[PDB]
Design a protein around this ligand. Structure first.
Ligand SMILES: Nc1ncnc2c1ncn2[C@@H]1O[C@H](COP(=O)(O)OP(=O)(O)NP(=O)(O)O)[C@@H](O)[C@H]1O
Ligand SMILES: Nc1ncnc2c1ncn2[C@@H]1O[C@H](COP(=O)(O)OP(=O)(O)NP(=O)(O)O)[C@@H](O)[C@H]1O
Ligand SMILES: [Mg+2]
Ligand SMILES: [Mg+2]
Lengths: 483, 482
């Protein structure tokens, strides 16, 4: 019994009137403090990003004008006694009009406006982090009061103080002496006093801002120490560098047995590094039912420490970093947005890694065999779980087997088997047994021996199950010899 | 090496001027359409919650005035030819000022102003979904134009038309006829044509809004036939409904082997149903097994289909729903605002489900043993990966073993071995073997059984690894016979 009330009754009768959308500013601020970020700590990531942007703008001006660069630095000070955290930078600072407009207008982004004015023809075009114009207001998560001192690098500019508790009102007054650049003093809330602890702030800086491009000093001590090697030309990164960075991003004590440094500007911008550990995972690690973990960055800022969306699940044995400007960030900057173009990135990363391994098998075959023994279970899992047959056959190119036509211990591919089939032979034949002795004593294989047919010999755990799910390769049916 | 440029040099010489924050209004609307939600279909969830809130206000107004309710309904129509989706509700509607204000001011929430006026003293205090005042703007994700017809239920109210292309201006004009209620007409973009298809919209509705409290119709068809039984008092929900709801929320064709209907207030208000499937996990390594969780709801709106945060990973085999009316939501309403509030909830649920399974072992021990065989791997994993010893020992209360002091096949807990420990004894002794025959003829057992001591026989995959990570139970150390 279909029931509907919807029909076109409505006839606009009258004169119209036009209005502008308004906003409730005090509430928008509270949305930022309460309902936006998953963690209170990211206010440090937001303020450091602003400090980086302010220095990047100053560097752009001075290099364009032929002036010498001064100290370009970001400083953090925790005072536990006073219950404060303080960030100060030596960048462009702000005039009084800039404090009013850029701090006082929600979603107003001076750095986005700077970007648009370049025609993105300069070097800072890809180094500038801010877009949304809300990031500063993250401080009202942890702050009772926020106290800003700023002095613009422009001629004749004095210092100003900017003061707000987040009420929808701020105060501005002239101030001295203020160093060129910006100093933000955060008076922490009752439950937020942990951000006046040096140890705590240190961890927050290291987690989010570790790769920032200007020297960062916490309570007098330099920090970064870590170059973002995914941004560099691959030919410029030593093995020592890849080893130390792998130990960092993977929290591991071993070495990478494989390193793929993948940079592409099309279709998407990708700065990525992927590592395969030396150590072989245990069956417990494998069955622990995890997803992919790869740290995700944009413009050197951490997005997520382990992003599960960027690599397929069968490639969770891989450790590394992926950086992109292209893919747009969620307003909270803790995740990505458009799901189809994420999946475009994942398909590209999947194809690029399968090509990497196919190439490692041709480059060094005995090394690849050891990698297949240690990681081949993941490829078997990936073939079993995949849905599109094209994925199954791509992953299946990595598999290796013995052969009745090769000596004991010699590994072959499905491709190499296909190359060796006779003129009209339509099928890839296989036998799954614990070892080559038991395979060759199979009564079902002895029948094959009367003919000229090659038989694949599969000794690995879940080989047969994998071949039943893969079911064909290169349009040739995979047929157990035991049927 | 001590270098810092921060010292307090600053003094205020000058006069203070006071200012109000402003906002860039068209960009704020752009942020909502682009940078907020992970999927664009969510505009349908947002419009249905607004329809539901309008109906809940009309219901509250009328009941407190002693009035009979008129028909309370939510309708959607897709038109593929015209490229539109339309939602209409018979609820409270909007005067002209309410149109200018509630649709025209970003973050202005009439529903939240309502809830505020009710101060948690009314039925509607727990049923009103809207807080933020942005959710209606989610339609500019998918729309070229949004034309709105509303007529307030205030007697002798005129109808009006609110029209916007989302560009930062909108238009208002009088209209007749407008049924008391609100009708929203969305003119979809080229890429969004999509939601002009009934099949697609039908999928979105059942995903998010399937439990909305008022009758919902899509092209005349009745959408929500399924009651939200986690809200019902537990003893009112019979086995037929659990079986059917289990199949819905788990996407499963079997029956639950166990069912726990759980309500409490601490740390939050929980209304939850937990199921263990009759089938047994296909072990194996992973396939879809990132997945297969409890769904998270708030005020009968889906937050997350697989709620990752609210149960420990080792409890991921559980299916069901957890609904909380007070749970802090992310602005996107796809996530939770992290707190001790979620982590306390996760521990309250872990404690509650461990208590559940202990109790099931005491009611039917034969049924519990089969659950232990099928689902034991999950508790071994949670014991290995747990950080805190007491969580390890809590989960370990669920483990069973055979024993040298019991007939072959009979199980035992660690507690029951502990309670047979003699006066002058010390540790819990265990032997892992493939079966009881090997455990009894083990060389290390013969050198043992001469003594008076009891030894567990552990035949399950990863029993050894599990006991090595536990290391201790009830402050008695776990010692292999090697
Ligand atoms: N340390 C600083 N020095 C100079 N200008 C700053 C500083 N911090 C913020 N500003 C200015 O104030 C504006 C507001 O900052 P913020 O609210 O973080 O927005 P945003 O950085 O532009 N965009 P996003 O960070 O993506 O939200 C910035 O665009 C800058 O123009
Ligand atoms: N169908 C409707 N009928 C009557 N009033 C409505 C309707 N839709 C929206 N409104 C009013 O317009 C306001 C804005 O809606 P919306 O932008 O969804 O904000 P919200 O629902 O208050 N909060 P949230 O949904 O949490 O962003 C609501 O609070 C209502 O007062
Ligand atoms: Mg910023
Ligand atoms: Mg709403």
């Amino acid at each position: 019994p279909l029931h509907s009330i919807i029909s076109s009754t409505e006839s606009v009768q009258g004169s119209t009137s036009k209005h502008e959308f308004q906003a409730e500013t005090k509430k928008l601020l509270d949305i930022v403090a309460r309902s936006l970020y998953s963690e209170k700590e990211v206010f440090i990531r937001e303020l450091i990003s602003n400090a980086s942007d302010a220095l990047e703008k100053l560097r752009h001006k001075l290099v364009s004008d032929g002036q010498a660069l001064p100290e370009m630095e970001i400083h953090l000070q925790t005072n536990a006694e006073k219950g404060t955290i303080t960030i100060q930078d030596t960048g462009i600072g702000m005039t009084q009009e800039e404090l009013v407009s850029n701090l006082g207008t929600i979603a107003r982004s001076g750095s986005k406006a700077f970007l648009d004015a370049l025609q993105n023809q300069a070097e800072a075009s890809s180094k500038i982090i801010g877009q949304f114009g809300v990031g500063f207001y993250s401080a009202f998560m942890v702050a009772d009061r926020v106290e800003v001192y700023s002095r613009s690098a422009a001629p004749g500019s004095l210092g100003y103080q900017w003061l707000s508790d987040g009420s929808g009102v701020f105060e501005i007054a002239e101030a001295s002496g203020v160093r060129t650049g910006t100093k933000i003093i955060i008076h922490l809330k009752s439950d937020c006093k942990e951000f006046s602890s040096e140890a705590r702030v240190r961890d927050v800086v290291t987690k989010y801002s570790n790769f920032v491009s200007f020297p960062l000093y916490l309570n007098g001590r330099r920090m970064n120490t870590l170059q973002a090697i995914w941004m560099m030309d691959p030919k410029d990164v030593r093995e020592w560098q890849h080893e130390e960075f792998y130990r960092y991003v993977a929290q591991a004590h071993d070495k990478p047995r494989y390193t793929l440094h993948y940079k592409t500007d099309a279709p998407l911008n990708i700065r990525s590094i992927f590592y395969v550990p030396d150590m072989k995972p245990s069956m417990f690690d494998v069955s622990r039912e995890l997803g992919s973990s790869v740290a995700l960055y944009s413009r050197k800022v951490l997005i997520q420490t382990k992003a599960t969306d960027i690599l397929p699940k069968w490639l969770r044995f891989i450790r590394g970093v992926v950086d992109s400007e292209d893919i747009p960030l969620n307003l909270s900057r803790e995740l990505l947005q458009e799901s189809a173009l994420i999946r475009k990135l994942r398909d590209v990363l999947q194809q690029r890694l399968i090509k990497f391994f196919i190439d490692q098998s041709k480059k060094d075959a005995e090394k690849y065999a050891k990698f297949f023994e240690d990681y081949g279970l993941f490829m078997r899992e990936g073939i079993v779980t995949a849905t599109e047959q094209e994925v199954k056959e791509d992953i299946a190119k990595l598999l290796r087997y013995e052969s009745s036509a090769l000596p004991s211990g010699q590994l072959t591919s499905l491709s190499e088997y296909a190359s060796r089939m006779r003129a009209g032979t339509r099928n890839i034949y296989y036998l799954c047994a614990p070892n080559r002795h038991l395979a060759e004593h199979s009564p079902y294989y002895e029948a094959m021996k009367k003919k000229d047919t090659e038989v694949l010999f599969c000794f690995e755990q879940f080989d047969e199950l994998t071949l039943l799910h893969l079911r064909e390769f290169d349009k040739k049916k995979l047929i157990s010899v035991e049927t």
